[PDB]
Amino acid sequence: SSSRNGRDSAAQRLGVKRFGGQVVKAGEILVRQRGTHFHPGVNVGRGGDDTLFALAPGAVEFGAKRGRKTVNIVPVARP
């Protein structure tokens, strides 16, 4: 007459936060995730909870490097 379940946790709002070709500031976090689904690419660092962030200003762009999806920051030219 009772359900032995009915509990869940809060949604953590994970996922890609900046997509390809998007200009970011240095320090912006770019994708929140659990494991390493996206590996840190060139000029992109990885946080303690596996959060990828940008170590330099530029444009986001994804890639594959030896069978590993990677995220990179590309230096846009100064006008």
Contact set with another protein (CB under 8 A): 1-3
Contacting Mg ion within 46-75 (CB under 5 A): 48
Residue closer to RNA (CB basis): 42 or 55: 42
Residue closer to another protein (CB basis): 5 or 9: 5
| Structural tokens at position 50 | 């596996």
Q: Minimum CB separation from RNA for residue 56, in Å? A: 17
* β-bridge pairing 39-40 and 69-74: parallel
Residue closer to RNA (CB basis): 47 or 68: 68
Neighbours of 7 (CB within 10 A): 4
Please tell me the distance from the alpha carbon of residue 24 to that of residue 2, in angstroms, as a whole number.
Answer: 51
Q: Minimum CB separation from RNA for residue 68, in Å? A: 5
Q: Partners of 44 in the beta sheet?
A: 54
